[PDB]
């Protein structure tokens, strides 16, 4: 029944629709706890993300390490997705087991447009990861000057 | 096709504070979960290898990573959890 | 031997007690690696797959292997027995 | 086998593969030497291969008992195996 | 040992590949770097090439790359081989009692039969279906 | 060592008026009665 | 000199932070029977950018400030040797 | 080529017996060869 | 330098013998390891084998086996020559 | 130290039972030692030649004779596991508590190589179980370190 996990990943849009229509769990989870939403977020299939979200996919589904599909799009610069997930509910202050916000992730990878979008939805800028670093701390240490100033 | 991969980030600052050697981290992580060929021995008159590694039961689960300790220069044992962090990602198993 | 490895002294304690390799690990004789496992007709097997050197003669080479192998048979442990599961050669011979 | 399967998963298939040759094609197949842990193409843990020798051309009369028919029939059947890719095929005249 | 496809590629495979030049009758080159920890570079030569010399040249370039490879990779010993790709035959070995386990047999085959088949003229490559024994020290982190 | 395994080299000749293939055949015969695990090979001129 | 460092310390840092580690895997053979997860463990990789080298942490002083590699060196892509320059009709060039 | 009528013999450890056992099998083969001076003559160890 | 016959055999001779594969037209291979620190290994080829070719093949394998030998031995090196017990002459040089 | 002395040395270490007999008839030395202080008794003990040991001991051989490193034939017998030779030597006067230059007794060596039968016999002939080497180890110690459960039971 998790031909859906595969089709998400694979990015086949009809195949996700048809198995969505045939009942298959929106929250099917693979060995590491990735949902078809996690998958679509990481692979950056915007079209799949919408469909899964229509059919009530858990937007804050967590994996064995505790990262959400939001966490992934932020880290990987899929802007449209960051929006769509944020709209549809996504905890923008989410933390994986290491204390890592999607802000931290988008910050570290220098995806500045996404930093703002997270910021707009109210992302805590003083959120420290397990080591006590903030998104600003990241930018200052990455030496990213644009991002640094954007975080104040 | 690609598969889930477990990526550990060793925090260079945190390690450097505690006094743990990066050499020590990587060897500890590596011998245990990967295996290391130490030297040879003789087994009934033929030269064969000695291997060090973790018993299967301590390298099975993502939670097991934190059960491995390395000794810092001050003598204290430090869990792998004090200086690392983790995420799932997708890499290749066969690069052509 | 395993007995001899287990006996290696990791450190002598503050009190004088001994810490031996056997006290922190399971010494045991086992594979270099554990990736390859064969069965022959359902039954536990091993064996060697043999690739013909570039340009070398198939039939002639096969022969040399059967000759070398035959020198080994008398010295086998009880029960040990060679079987011939895959062989490209006899078709050549039979067909010519 | 798919991404990140295990020896156990693979072996289970190998068993079904071995099983098929031993039960369904017993009238034609002499041996099945099967290995878990590689397959021409890849070399992993989700990988397996099986060498199969037939009984002599005489006890295999007619088109139905020659390799092309057997391997098509084997492959056809093997397709019904859940969650794997199992191919049976003849090796050609010139391997190159 | 214990390395992933990317670590094997970017630490061995590439380093080797980059020292392959001025090698006669070379038609192409292909390699796989994988997650067991294994590389497999195959240089394929114009039909008619003396395989003996193709080996001597390839290995010559390889000796240049060798000490740039990592100690562990050297210490497993790298091979260079002039064989066909297909199997000529599989010599199977069983125990018609059950006095020897699968592990036991493999160790026999390896320490008692393999080397000599390996040395037989005509024999390009010998793959052991299983593993020779090794003194395994299996560590426990709690006790450690 | 000889072809990989531990070994011990043994020299000798055929006695007055005997052939070498005779002396050899006896060595071969005599060797069969050696302890289990002990084998033997002909090297050098004898190989040839 | 301002940070009480030598080329030696620079080299050590670069060796430790520009590392590529064999880290092992989760569920590697020999596995505990019944394991479900097989995934490679990724640790440090080779740095890829001028910036990543800039971040390399050389040390951290008592007051908490952090001395990076960029605080003691300029950091750019430039050739292994600057000994050989070519011009083509006196215009900048490279060649084989 | 050494000696015609002369032979060159290798005793071989085909099962992990070791030095002591091999010296012994050698001793036996030598002693049992010395008891045929009509075929075998001057049968000797090559090593130390 | 300074090794006993066993040390020599078990760290050097075996490792080399173990790596002498894939060489063409071997008939037999003999070796002596002694109390003076020296090993010789003699590989003897079929009649009519190109001695140059045989010598390079042998050395190419030794090369590869080299990192498997002790420090103090790779340091001394391991020479590979043709066997010819034919001197044209011997010039003695004495002091009276 | 003589033509026959050395000859006897050769014969004992190889165990040519007959050649020994003759040399014995001829009055060959039983105290002929080589460069390391081994007499034909030592040689016969190390190498496990029971008939010779018995023969030599009848001919006035020294049973507590000792190498340049302090080791008596009983040591060599106990260490190398020849029960019968151990019994003979002991019955013929051997010192069971003889300590080589390292303080190592024949009990010690039997213990290390785990020849328990030899241990009992040595125990039976009254070997000091509490005696200790230069490093201060008992045969019990040797046993626990080697992890011989059966052997450590005996040595209590």
PDB file of N, CA and C in Angstrom, chain J residues 91-136:
ATOM      1  N   UNK J  91      59.706 -39.439  40.715  1.00  0.00           N
ATOM      2  CA  UNK J  91      59.946 -40.700  41.408  1.00  0.00           C
ATOM      3  C   UNK J  91      61.450 -40.952  41.601  1.00  0.00           C
ATOM      4  N   UNK J  92      62.244 -40.496  40.633  1.00  0.00           N
ATOM      5  CA  UNK J  92      63.698 -40.642  40.668  1.00  0.00           C
ATOM      6  C   UNK J  92      64.446 -39.500  41.366  1.00  0.00           C
ATOM      7  N   UNK J  93      63.730 -38.664  42.102  1.00  0.00           N
ATOM      8  CA  UNK J  93      64.396 -37.732  42.993  1.00  0.00           C
ATOM      9  C   UNK J  93      64.266 -36.261  42.666  1.00  0.00           C
ATOM     10  N   UNK J  94      63.686 -35.962  41.502  1.00  0.00           N
ATOM     11  CA  UNK J  94      63.574 -34.586  41.014  1.00  0.00           C
ATOM     12  C   UNK J  94      63.051 -33.642  42.083  1.00  0.00           C
ATOM     13  N   UNK J  95      63.553 -32.412  42.057  1.00  0.00           N
ATOM     14  CA  UNK J  95      63.061 -31.339  42.901  1.00  0.00           C
ATOM     15  C   UNK J  95      61.823 -30.784  42.230  1.00  0.00           C
ATOM     16  N   UNK J  96      60.707 -30.822  42.946  1.00  0.00           N
ATOM     17  CA  UNK J  96      59.428 -30.382  42.409  1.00  0.00           C
ATOM     18  C   UNK J  96      59.233 -28.854  42.572  1.00  0.00           C
ATOM     19  N   UNK J  97      60.023 -28.244  43.456  1.00  0.00           N
ATOM     20  CA  UNK J  97      59.919 -26.811  43.732  1.00  0.00           C
ATOM     21  C   UNK J  97      61.135 -26.043  43.246  1.00  0.00           C
ATOM     22  N   UNK J  98      61.798 -26.580  42.233  1.00  0.00           N
ATOM     23  CA  UNK J  98      62.984 -25.939  41.704  1.00  0.00           C
ATOM     24  C   UNK J  98      62.584 -24.668  40.986  1.00  0.00           C
ATOM     25  N   UNK J  99      63.300 -23.591  41.267  1.00  0.00           N
ATOM     26  CA  UNK J  99      62.989 -22.314  40.653  1.00  0.00           C
ATOM     27  C   UNK J  99      64.088 -21.914  39.687  1.00  0.00           C
ATOM     28  N   UNK J 100      63.751 -21.750  38.405  1.00  0.00           N
ATOM     29  CA  UNK J 100      64.718 -21.196  37.450  1.00  0.00           C
ATOM     30  C   UNK J 100      65.120 -19.767  37.857  1.00  0.00           C
ATOM     31  N   UNK J 101      66.017 -19.143  37.101  1.00  0.00           N
ATOM     32  CA  UNK J 101      66.514 -17.820  37.483  1.00  0.00           C
ATOM     33  C   UNK J 101      65.438 -16.736  37.552  1.00  0.00           C
ATOM     34  N   UNK J 102      64.270 -17.030  36.989  1.00  0.00           N
ATOM     35  CA  UNK J 102      63.166 -16.093  37.010  1.00  0.00           C
ATOM     36  C   UNK J 102      62.217 -16.402  38.148  1.00  0.00           C
ATOM     37  N   UNK J 103      62.525 -17.442  38.926  1.00  0.00           N
ATOM     38  CA  UNK J 103      61.666 -17.863  40.027  1.00  0.00           C
ATOM     39  C   UNK J 103      60.511 -18.763  39.600  1.00  0.00           C
ATOM     40  N   UNK J 104      60.567 -19.225  38.356  1.00  0.00           N
ATOM     41  CA  UNK J 104      59.530 -20.046  37.746  1.00  0.00           C
ATOM     42  C   UNK J 104      59.726 -21.523  38.089  1.00  0.00           C
ATOM     43  N   UNK J 105      58.734 -22.114  38.744  1.00  0.00           N
ATOM     44  CA  UNK J 105      58.777 -23.518  39.127  1.00  0.00           C
ATOM     45  C   UNK J 105      58.157 -24.358  38.021  1.00  0.00           C
ATOM     46  N   UNK J 106      58.320 -25.694  38.096  1.00  0.00           N
ATOM     47  CA  UNK J 106      57.686 -26.577  37.109  1.00  0.00           C
ATOM     48  C   UNK J 106      56.177 -26.584  37.230  1.00  0.00           C
ATOM     49  N   UNK J 107      55.672 -26.420  38.445  1.00  0.00           N
ATOM     50  CA  UNK J 107      54.256 -26.143  38.625  1.00  0.00           C
ATOM     51  C   UNK J 107      53.813 -24.970  37.723  1.00  0.00           C
ATOM     52  N   UNK J 108      54.520 -23.843  37.811  1.00  0.00           N
ATOM     53  CA  UNK J 108      54.190 -22.656  37.007  1.00  0.00           C
ATOM     54  C   UNK J 108      53.981 -22.975  35.534  1.00  0.00           C
ATOM     55  N   UNK J 109      54.953 -23.655  34.943  1.00  0.00           N
ATOM     56  CA  UNK J 109      54.937 -23.886  33.512  1.00  0.00           C
ATOM     57  C   UNK J 109      53.806 -24.807  33.112  1.00  0.00           C
ATOM     58  N   UNK J 110      53.506 -25.790  33.956  1.00  0.00           N
ATOM     59  CA  UNK J 110      52.449 -26.737  33.631  1.00  0.00           C
ATOM     60  C   UNK J 110      51.153 -25.976  33.687  1.00  0.00           C
ATOM     61  N   UNK J 111      51.050 -25.121  34.697  1.00  0.00           N
ATOM     62  CA  UNK J 111      49.888 -24.267  34.849  1.00  0.00           C
ATOM     63  C   UNK J 111      49.656 -23.424  33.587  1.00  0.00           C
ATOM     64  N   UNK J 112      50.677 -22.695  33.153  1.00  0.00           N
ATOM     65  CA  UNK J 112      50.525 -21.820  31.996  1.00  0.00           C
ATOM     66  C   UNK J 112      50.046 -22.546  30.748  1.00  0.00           C
ATOM     67  N   UNK J 113      50.594 -23.730  30.494  1.00  0.00           N
ATOM     68  CA  UNK J 113      50.221 -24.451  29.284  1.00  0.00           C
ATOM     69  C   UNK J 113      49.026 -25.355  29.559  1.00  0.00           C
ATOM     70  N   UNK J 114      48.541 -25.315  30.798  1.00  0.00           N
ATOM     71  CA  UNK J 114      47.293 -25.966  31.156  1.00  0.00           C
ATOM     72  C   UNK J 114      47.281 -27.487  31.169  1.00  0.00           C
ATOM     73  N   UNK J 115      48.450 -28.089  31.352  1.00  0.00           N
ATOM     74  CA  UNK J 115      48.552 -29.534  31.477  1.00  0.00           C
ATOM     75  C   UNK J 115      48.172 -29.931  32.893  1.00  0.00           C
ATOM     76  N   UNK J 116      46.883 -30.154  33.115  1.00  0.00           N
ATOM     77  CA  UNK J 116      46.353 -30.325  34.467  1.00  0.00           C
ATOM     78  C   UNK J 116      46.798 -31.614  35.111  1.00  0.00           C
ATOM     79  N   UNK J 117      46.806 -32.686  34.328  1.00  0.00           N
ATOM     80  CA  UNK J 117      47.296 -33.973  34.801  1.00  0.00           C
ATOM     81  C   UNK J 117      48.692 -33.844  35.416  1.00  0.00           C
ATOM     82  N   UNK J 118      49.582 -33.146  34.707  1.00  0.00           N
ATOM     83  CA  UNK J 118      50.917 -32.814  35.205  1.00  0.00           C
ATOM     84  C   UNK J 118      50.840 -31.998  36.489  1.00  0.00           C
ATOM     85  N   UNK J 119      49.828 -31.146  36.595  1.00  0.00           N
ATOM     86  CA  UNK J 119      49.696 -30.293  37.771  1.00  0.00           C
ATOM     87  C   UNK J 119      49.359 -31.123  39.001  1.00  0.00           C
ATOM     88  N   UNK J 120      48.383 -32.008  38.841  1.00  0.00           N
ATOM     89  CA  UNK J 120      47.957 -32.873  39.924  1.00  0.00           C
ATOM     90  C   UNK J 120      49.140 -33.686  40.421  1.00  0.00           C
ATOM     91  N   UNK J 121      49.842 -34.313  39.478  1.00  0.00           N
ATOM     92  CA  UNK J 121      51.022 -35.111  39.785  1.00  0.00           C
ATOM     93  C   UNK J 121      52.045 -34.302  40.563  1.00  0.00           C
ATOM     94  N   UNK J 122      52.295 -33.075  40.113  1.00  0.00           N
ATOM     95  CA  UNK J 122      53.249 -32.213  40.794  1.00  0.00           C
ATOM     96  C   UNK J 122      52.677 -31.830  42.133  1.00  0.00           C
ATOM     97  N   UNK J 123      51.367 -31.647  42.167  1.00  0.00           N
ATOM     98  CA  UNK J 123      50.736 -31.316  43.421  1.00  0.00           C
ATOM     99  C   UNK J 123      50.897 -32.506  44.340  1.00  0.00           C
ATOM    100  N   UNK J 124      50.576 -33.695  43.825  1.00  0.00           N
ATOM    101  CA  UNK J 124      50.702 -34.941  44.591  1.00  0.00           C
ATOM    102  C   UNK J 124      52.091 -35.146  45.195  1.00  0.00           C
ATOM    103  N   UNK J 125      53.135 -34.760  44.458  1.00  0.00           N
ATOM    104  CA  UNK J 125      54.503 -34.845  44.980  1.00  0.00           C
ATOM    105  C   UNK J 125      54.881 -33.605  45.791  1.00  0.00           C
ATOM    106  N   UNK J 126      53.877 -32.804  46.149  1.00  0.00           N
ATOM    107  CA  UNK J 126      54.038 -31.746  47.134  1.00  0.00           C
ATOM    108  C   UNK J 126      54.615 -30.436  46.640  1.00  0.00           C
ATOM    109  N   UNK J 127      54.183 -30.012  45.457  1.00  0.00           N
ATOM    110  CA  UNK J 127      54.607 -28.733  44.903  1.00  0.00           C
ATOM    111  C   UNK J 127      53.969 -27.579  45.669  1.00  0.00           C
ATOM    112  N   UNK J 128      54.791 -26.623  46.091  1.00  0.00           N
ATOM    113  CA  UNK J 128      54.306 -25.421  46.767  1.00  0.00           C
ATOM    114  C   UNK J 128      53.406 -24.614  45.838  1.00  0.00           C
ATOM    115  N   UNK J 129      52.110 -24.650  46.107  1.00  0.00           N
ATOM    116  CA  UNK J 129      51.139 -23.981  45.255  1.00  0.00           C
ATOM    117  C   UNK J 129      51.218 -22.468  45.460  1.00  0.00           C
ATOM    118  N   UNK J 130      51.788 -22.072  46.586  1.00  0.00           N
ATOM    119  CA  UNK J 130      51.884 -20.663  46.922  1.00  0.00           C
ATOM    120  C   UNK J 130      53.153 -19.981  46.424  1.00  0.00           C
ATOM    121  N   UNK J 131      54.035 -20.755  45.798  1.00  0.00           N
ATOM    122  CA  UNK J 131      55.324 -20.238  45.357  1.00  0.00           C
ATOM    123  C   UNK J 131      55.138 -19.281  44.196  1.00  0.00           C
ATOM    124  N   UNK J 132      55.964 -18.246  44.150  1.00  0.00           N
ATOM    125  CA  UNK J 132      55.743 -17.195  43.170  1.00  0.00           C
ATOM    126  C   UNK J 132      56.998 -16.748  42.433  1.00  0.00           C
ATOM    127  N   UNK J 133      56.803 -16.411  41.162  1.00  0.00           N
ATOM    128  CA  UNK J 133      57.887 -15.974  40.295  1.00  0.00           C
ATOM    129  C   UNK J 133      58.444 -14.585  40.673  1.00  0.00           C
ATOM    130  N   UNK J 134      59.385 -14.079  39.871  1.00  0.00           N
ATOM    131  CA  UNK J 134      60.038 -12.791  40.129  1.00  0.00           C
ATOM    132  C   UNK J 134      59.021 -11.667  40.077  1.00  0.00           C
ATOM    133  N   UNK J 135      57.973 -11.880  39.291  1.00  0.00           N
ATOM    134  CA  UNK J 135      56.901 -10.910  39.146  1.00  0.00           C
ATOM    135  C   UNK J 135      55.864 -11.098  40.257  1.00  0.00           C
ATOM    136  N   UNK J 136      56.006 -12.185  41.018  1.00  0.00           N
ATOM    137  CA  UNK J 136      55.185 -12.444  42.192  1.00  0.00           C
ATOM    138  C   UNK J 136      53.881 -13.176  41.929  1.00  0.00           C
TER     139      UNK J 136
END
